[PDB]
Every structure is written in C-alpha cells, then in structure tokens.
C-alpha cells in the first residue's frame, strides 16, 4: 500500500495520470487534502512531481512507463526537466514548442513506440500552461502537438482523471 | 508485387492467429479466395480479412461507432481501388499527407484494420522512397512508422528507416 495524497486546489495532474496509469500493476491510493505528495515507505517520502512520476514508473516495471533502452530511459528524463523547465513558465514559448512540434513530427509518442512518462509529463504540464491555452481558442497551433494533446486527451485513463479533476 | 493471398497469410499472423488456410486465386486479377469452413466460399482480400478478424475475437479492428465502421470501410475500399498506383503514387501521398496532419490513425483516433491493409499496401511504394520524399510526405511518414512498430504487425516485412528527431 502506496499512497499519495493531491493538492486539492490544484491536482498535479500528470502524477494522477501515472496513478490511473499503474493502478493494476501496485496496490495505490489517492488522497486529497493537504499538498501533493507520496508515502513508499513513510520513513522515505516523495514531494514533487518529477520525483513521484519516476517512483511509481521505476516500482510498477510491469507497466512500460520508464521505456526498454537506456536511452529512451534517458529520453524520458530529458522530457521531465523540459517541462518542468521551458514549460514551467512561459519564456521563448514559441522557441519552447516549436521544439515540441519539431521532435514529435515523426513520433506517434514522444516515446517512440509506446506510452511513457514524457508524455503524461510534458501533455500534463502543456494543459495547465495557458499560453498554450491561447493557441488553442485562436486556432494557431503547433500541428503536430495538436493531434498528440488530442491523441492522448482521448484516451481511456486521460479521460477519466479530467472527469474527476475538472 | 505482393499476391493477396500472400497478403492473408501474412495478416493471420499479424492478427495472432495460430491456424493458416489454404488459399486461391482466381483469374487475371488474381482475387484472393476461401473454400470456407463457414459458409460459401469467400472472395476478395477486404471480405477474408474481415472474417479473419473476425476469426481472431478482434472486431474492434473494424471500428465501434457507425461513423468508424463507415470509415474502416472506405480505407477498405480505397485499398483495393486506388492502392492495387503505376503512373503516379504522389498524387496519392499528397492527399493522405493532409488527411494525416490531424490524426494518428486512419479512423480517427483509433486502431483499425485500415491501418495495417492500407500500410500493407503502400509498403512497396514507401520503401521504394527517398529520405528526400519522406520529409515531403511528413504525415505519411509519421503514420508509416508508427505501424511497422505496432505490436505483431510488420511480420517479415522490411524496415523503413525514418529519422527520428
């Protein structure tokens, strides 16, 4: 029993997607309540995003969330910090998914092949930017990011955490 | 290039299909036939592949919703008229380039039995591309890579290379 408990406010969303993603895969809980944070062993402890999105894909290898190679680990790594920086707050934004339209031109997934932490991450903290929010209304997007955040928006476990956190 | 019924044996295992039939051909055209375990005999590469779909528990592949059914079918017919082509391939990938832009897959949003008939069938022609082209027809390319690496599809089929970014 894992449990992590969201910042009611503001959901980490992303953290919920890999929560929603590796529920069949490790007995986990989500609280509400206080700040966004998670318990393992409760002597050790996990408060901030990339930390806990890195834990539950490292524990639930079952699940594909961390990718096959060594690469594509590191990829996924790079993916994190990107977001968590250039997409943080906005700054050079057009420079910031340009790069994001660019890479995913030919990638289905930022992953390559399959779902992995990149994506929940980086569609995560794209939805709650609102810069991008404003590309969207004005229908003067990225094409490419467009059918990725549509994509994934669609999709079974994306959809269900938007239900609960809207 | 590639005999349907080749195609079929082909796509048996794609599916997960452990069983391969013997199959036919019939006249110039050389349109794919079943002597059938259910039924009268089944005829055409669109009609065999829908039963061994079928066959497989897999009807999702051939859409949910009406509206991607009614998809499914028009790749489905798209595949043995304009895919099955001589004088000019470009014209085709052009148009597919542009319906791609927006999606992943050829219904929208989801994986269909369009998807591996129409990657089968262009197979021949993207390997025979460019890196050039590739970049040209960036949608195309996108998609085309994306099904060689779905699960269970390519079989033997030769790797397209694609430059990641």
């Not at chain 1, 910031?96 to 995913?104: V, Y």
């Not at chain 2, 470009?90 to 269909?112: A, M, P």
């Not at chain 2, 129409?118 to 998609?143: A, P």
Request: negative net charge.
């Amino acid at each position: 029993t894992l449990s992590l408990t969201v910042n009611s406010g503001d959901p980490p969303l992303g953290a919920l997607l890999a929560v929603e993603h590796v529920k069949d895969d490790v007995s986990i809980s989500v609280e509400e309540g206080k700040e966004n944070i998670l318990h393992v062993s409760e002597n050790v402890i996990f408060t901030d995003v990339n930390s806990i999105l890195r834990y539950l894909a490292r524990v639930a290898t079952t699940a594909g969330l961390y990718g096959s190679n060594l690469m594509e680990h590191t990829e996924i790594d790079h993916w994190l910090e990107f977001s968590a920086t250039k997409l943080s707050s906005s700054d050079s934004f057009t420079s910031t998914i340009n790069e994001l339209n660019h890479s995913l031109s030919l990638r289905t997934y930022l992953v390559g092949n399959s779902l992995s932490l990149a994506d929940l991450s980086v569609w995560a903290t794209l939805k709650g930017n609102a810069a991008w929010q404003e590309q969207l209304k004005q229908k003067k997007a990225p094409v490419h990011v467009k059918r990725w955040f549509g994509f994934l928006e669609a999709q079974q476990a994306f959809q269900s955490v938007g239900t609960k956190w809207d | 290039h590639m005999a349907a019924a080749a195609e079929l044996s082909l796509l048996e295992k794609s599916l997960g299909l452990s069983k391969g039939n013997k199959y036919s051909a019939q006249g110039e055209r050389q349109i794919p036939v079943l002597q059938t375990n259910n039924g009268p005999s089944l005829t055409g590469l669109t009609t065999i592949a829908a039963h061994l779909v079928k066959q497989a528990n897999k009807e999702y592949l051939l859409g949910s919703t009406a509206e991607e059914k009614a998809i499914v079918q028009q790749w489905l017919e798209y595949r043995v008229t304009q895919v099955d082509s001589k004088n000019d391939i470009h014209t085709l990938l052009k148009d597919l380039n542009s319906y791609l832009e927006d999606k992943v897959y050829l219904t929208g949003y989801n994986f269909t039995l369009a998807d591996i008939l129409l990657y089968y069938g262009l197979h021949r022609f993207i390997v025979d591309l460019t890196v050039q082209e590739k970049e040209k027809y960036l949608n195309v390319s996108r998609w085309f890579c994306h099904i060689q690496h779905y699960p269970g599809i390519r079989q033997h089929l030769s790797s397209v290379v694609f430059i990641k970014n």
